[PDB]
């Protein structure tokens, strides 16, 4: 998980965090901001939920753009960066790049994970299990989550129950006739 702010935009939609079409996917998403497509502008893309506090924690990253109304309608920059360069508090990382027009690429670093980390810290010296109560209460919380997954699986099965019958059956136009009939009586009278 991670929390921060993205600090620019490139096209209303631009190239995803990754794709299975060349390796494995990471979200295609868009922030709609618009400008001219062959000479200067320097727009922005924004959210609270896009710069969310949950996240895939880390990657050695690839910057790709796409789109840009219809005047651009296509890619605009290609770049790469191992992410330790963009540290989490105030810790700016930056570019200037220009695959069809110049853009001084600006991004701000103004403001299971825990489990795996704990293992490492445990391994780092001579140590005990101490207050294992904490683990008991945690497994109970895990269970509340597991219940939820099962609930989702039940809903998964429920979803097809009526859909077979719904796909199975048309009467449909039957309604329009009685509706017209109800209207016609009244109008005629």
């Amino acid at each position: 998980i991670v929390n921060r702010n993205g600090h620019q935009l490139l096209d209303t939609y631009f190239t995803l965090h990754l794709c299975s079409t060349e390796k494995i996917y990471k979200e295609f998403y868009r922030s709609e901001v618009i400008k001219n497509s062959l000479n200067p502008t320097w727009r922005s893309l924004d959210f609270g939920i896009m710069p969310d506090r949950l996240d895939t924690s880390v990657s050695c990253f690839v910057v790709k753009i796409w789109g840009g109304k219809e005047n651009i309608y296509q890619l605009l920059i290609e770049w790469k960066v191992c992410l330790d360069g963009l540290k989490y508090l105030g810790q700016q990382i930056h570019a200037r790049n220009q695959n069809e027009i110049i853009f001084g690429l600006n991004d701000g670093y103004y403001g299971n994970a825990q489990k795996t980390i704990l293992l490492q810290v445990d391994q780092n010296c001579v140590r005990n299990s101490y207050d294992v109560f904490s683990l008991l209460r945690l497994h109970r919380a895990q269970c509340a989550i597991k219940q939820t997954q099962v609930t989702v699986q039940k809903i998964g099965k429920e979803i097809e129950e009526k859909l077979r019958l719904t796909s199975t059956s048309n009467e449909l136009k039957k309604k329009s006739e009685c509706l017209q009939l109800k209207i016609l009586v009244l109008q005629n009278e």
Partner: peptide
């Protein structure tokens, strides 16, 4: 699901 099982397995592996 694996993380909840890994919690239990880890508490065993401790």
């Amino acid at each position: 699901a694996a993380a909840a099982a890994a919690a239990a397995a880890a508490a065993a592996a401790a």
